[PDB]
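Obj.: predict assembly geometry.
Materials: sequence records (below).
Method: joint structure prediction, all chains together.
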Amino acid sequence: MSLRIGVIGTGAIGKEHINRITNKLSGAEIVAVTDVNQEAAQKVVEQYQLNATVYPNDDSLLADENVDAVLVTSWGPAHESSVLKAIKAQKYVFCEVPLATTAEGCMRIVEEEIKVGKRLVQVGFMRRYDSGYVQLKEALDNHVIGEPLMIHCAHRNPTVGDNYTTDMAVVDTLVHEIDVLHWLVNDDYESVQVIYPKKSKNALPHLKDPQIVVIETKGGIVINAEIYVNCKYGYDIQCEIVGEDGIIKLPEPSSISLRKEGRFSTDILMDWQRRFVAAYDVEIQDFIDSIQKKGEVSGPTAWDGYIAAVTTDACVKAQESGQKEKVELKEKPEFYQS
Amino acid sequence: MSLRIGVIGTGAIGKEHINRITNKLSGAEIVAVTDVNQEAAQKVVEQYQLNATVYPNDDSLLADENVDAVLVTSWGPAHESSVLKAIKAQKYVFCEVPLATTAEGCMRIVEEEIKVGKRLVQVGFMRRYDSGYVQLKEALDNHVIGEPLMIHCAHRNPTVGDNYTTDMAVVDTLVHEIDVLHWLVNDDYESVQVIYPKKSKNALPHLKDPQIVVIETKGGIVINAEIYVNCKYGYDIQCEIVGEDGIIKLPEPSSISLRKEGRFSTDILMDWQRRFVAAYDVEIQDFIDSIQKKGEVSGPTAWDGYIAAVTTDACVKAQESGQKEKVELKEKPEFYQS
Amino acid sequence: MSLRIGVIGTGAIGKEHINRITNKLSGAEIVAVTDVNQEAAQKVVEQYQLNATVYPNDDSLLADENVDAVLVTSWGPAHESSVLKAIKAQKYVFCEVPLATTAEGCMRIVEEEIKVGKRLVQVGFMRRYDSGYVQLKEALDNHVIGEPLMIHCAHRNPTVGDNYTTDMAVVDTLVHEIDVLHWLVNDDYESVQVIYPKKSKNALPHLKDPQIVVIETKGGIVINAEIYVNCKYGYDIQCEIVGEDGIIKLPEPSSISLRKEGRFSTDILMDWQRRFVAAYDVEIQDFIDSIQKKGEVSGPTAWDGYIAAVTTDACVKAQESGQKEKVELKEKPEFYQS
Amino acid sequence: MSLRIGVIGTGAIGKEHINRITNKLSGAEIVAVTDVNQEAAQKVVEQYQLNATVYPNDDSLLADENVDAVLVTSWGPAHESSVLKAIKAQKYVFCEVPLATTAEGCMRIVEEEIKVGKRLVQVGFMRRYDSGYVQLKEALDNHVIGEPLMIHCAHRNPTVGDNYTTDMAVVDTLVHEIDVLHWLVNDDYESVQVIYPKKSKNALPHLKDPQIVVIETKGGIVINAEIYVNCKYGYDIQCEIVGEDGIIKLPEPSSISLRKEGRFSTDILMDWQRRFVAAYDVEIQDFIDSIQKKGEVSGPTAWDGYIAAVTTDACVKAQESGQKEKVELKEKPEFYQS
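Observations (raw structure tokens):
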């Protein structure tokens, strides 16, 4: 029996997930949609040739007893409301980043989920499903390099639009690093500090770019995360983990090599949408498969969403203060302990 | 509407394809199976929880008007018979390598398909769907290196069983190179010659390993293909194409790097079944999608199967003779021209 | 006419330079030596078969009118005294690191040299002559990456002895990075801060290792320098410079690659004495050649020694304080301006 | 005491060696020169400020009892005559490639040297002193990959002049591979065969380029050597040795890496004169040092010159015949056995 999925929010993000579920992945079907703009939802049902009911809002969609699970892919600030409604309707939910805009919002979700007795919520941190990050996690789990001590990472983007602001470097961009790193080393964040190098000619007058975020974990791991969103040369993710006895490093995306006109070279991606395509497929397939096999979801958790929200807020605070800011995290509930 | 697929031959190969269709890919369902050993087919239906009819033979399966397409994954020498039956029953067919065991067998299939007026047969040369080979093809199509002049490639395997014989290096192993290279450079083979270096200590007394196959295309491209099936260190595919003005090269499979105990290193796969997993998925998804969108298949063709059979026979002849042997190919029909 | 060189200090360092001058390089001869322990100097004259006078002290050696130039390779704290004596005797001088132990000591040398009207002093920062660093400097001079914005570097060592202390990570080890970086980007240091990750199991109880030093230049370049002197895996120098429009990176020392037992790998050096052998040769040959061609030396200057001493002191201060410490540098004299 | 060296032939090659001996290396001096054009020799003495006697011919230079050793850097076909004269005058001799133009000429030299009772002749195959080739030799000597089975190598050049002819690809260019490979694997050549791919647009009508030379050793190692002298992209030497249990490969010349405009890249040299600069220095320093320490030379031998001459002749024969040609080598004398 195919998992029957309703989609809340049919913009670009929702459309891509609908496409993968309908045309690429196994074991599920889109049976319902809703968008703030009903005309857009109807258009999407036609665009993708869905056998799907269009609902005026998420309450009515969630009341459809033929809906087993939902994707929350609406406007970012609206995610939290739908997640809470889904947990109350006892439906599984895949929520695109962010889970909620504040630590308090994530806590509301956490408290409601912990009542359910099983995991309903998976948050869309797709990097955990990227084959490179999976290999890193495997090496760490096997103690290949001894205790991790330091992490050097970078998130670089060729250019950004006029609307991209300083806070977004952490809130929209670094949030992915924020999730993946504490997962990799099984250690929680203690503090963050932001340092601004000289501003790049490639950045608009209002934007502070590049920036360096220094994050320390409770166990003493020191992370220096470079964010440079106008680096011109490409879209580029780098991550190196220095352990006691060795060093592991995320690979480049696969590319044929070229010898030509005095250079030996490989491609660097220009389009961020080409970097993690496979991970988005695998994360949604895991959502489907875990529900079918286990009756509960298995990816990044509501708690991970909480960690990200708390840490993002602290980074933005540090962007403004110039001081080292504490990351104040509640103790992780046994409900979320591996 | 899902494509309704029948499977002819439910051994290890058939089981893997059934698994991908049922659990990984989109747009198709296994509705029927048959195996020489009916008990094995029944077991597979139960193993994979299929809603599928077990037929005693391929004729009865092909007579099921609810079957739209078939996979031919039986014993190698039996492939040809099922392919011919499917073409006569006017069903689309995906045939695992080889299409047929002789040039004449492939010609029988070709002559029958060319009557149909559309392409029914796709042959399982999965390498054409590997992202690395796709990148190579793109560079060549874009004339990045000018005219290809020479190709240096290698197919290496850690060790083989007692039953692996000299002819199999070409028939089972090099056949994949044989298909992919002429596709890459759009040029047909003219001659082959086999040279034996000193025998490896890692090979059994009966096996000639390693070997070098030199293949020349009608256009004058010279290919030197190394086959070494007891190389001990890993499973390894290498391909470098030297053009007039530059050189392109297939990448290593993606791997984190490690600095440890005086070495900077990446993984080499040990298991050949881990090398092309993604390509098998993509090739079958293409079979499904092309039938749905175009009403005809789009992968390697019956003609490609013919080329492989003719070329494999010539290589085996050269293994025995020590001389340069002609690859005698009929002119490619307009039916198969891009 | 060969340059006639006297050596002040015939320990291990002095012996290596004597060896290169006598057995490897062109245009100079060792005509005189002195060591605190006369017996050791005499032994060295015999060991290397020198036609050289043994002097009881540097004053008597410097009074030898057949001495054109001196190497100062004595005990570190004793360097300054010999350098001042040589400048007064108007002899060219190559001084091993450090020029002097304090900013004030380097200033004494600077003030005396600036009177001479030509450059007499070259300081032994050999990295500027390493082919990799030379390539980096060339790219930067040619504006290949636009303005440098950030530098990520590392100085790693397999293990250290019981006597190696926390301050030495900066004074003995990072001093080389300290010299090379400001030279690369033509920008002076403004501040330093030290951050301690969790201590490595590989470090002795008294040693803080690893450490991260964050250095900001007056122009706004941010440098994060990792020092890890018990990394176990090898001796390893890494340097990446992120500019506005691209990124350049120091290469690995040259090594054949190996495919074996499931790994594709290159060597990492274990012995720090194998990393910069060529640079030591080239730096001394430059000392010889510049004196012969220009009548003045051309390498790292007394001023560079001053920068290093001031910066090293500030790092050690920051190691203790945990705060960001200012690097207070006098304005660079026109005497030292390119 | 410096080794007193006379130079026979003061063209471009002789001038470079004179420069390295006079300005770069240790332990020797140029005390005499001769060139067919006396005016050119005199000019060179002035150009390099030598304290050197100009002799009208090699006989008079060799009669100078203050000459300890000679370099033979004259016109290629004239090398043999000077080498024989030097052996008769009992002087050490460094001979640029080729030792002689025919197997018979090399044999004349061999027979005369074997009378001397010690090695006088070193042939200028500088690749044996390149750090990459030295590393390859070390791995092989240590049995890192088990028995060598196959070698894949390439000698590529960006473009050649109008005067460059088909035979020169082997005689001038591949001769270096010819020397280095049999040295690497300690195995002598048995046969050669030449195969011509389609001609490159980059080659002139008279030149066959590229070409592939297949060489088999007596022990059964199979070598495929690609020569492509109009490859446009750079000057490039590649060498991969496939052994029973692993594979070793010559590294790229060291280069910083660059991320810029969608590419991650390293430099490829354009100028062949930049590839082996260090090896030329080391080979001449070895000539000097071995004579001083051992009273006999230690590099590539007169016998190696013989092997090269015999093998080059066989390659040129195969270029013309299209058949596999024998490499007919006399048994190596105990005089030349390690």
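Conclusions so far: The CA atoms of residues 257 and 266 of chain C lie 5 Å apart.
To do: check interface contacts against the pulldown list.
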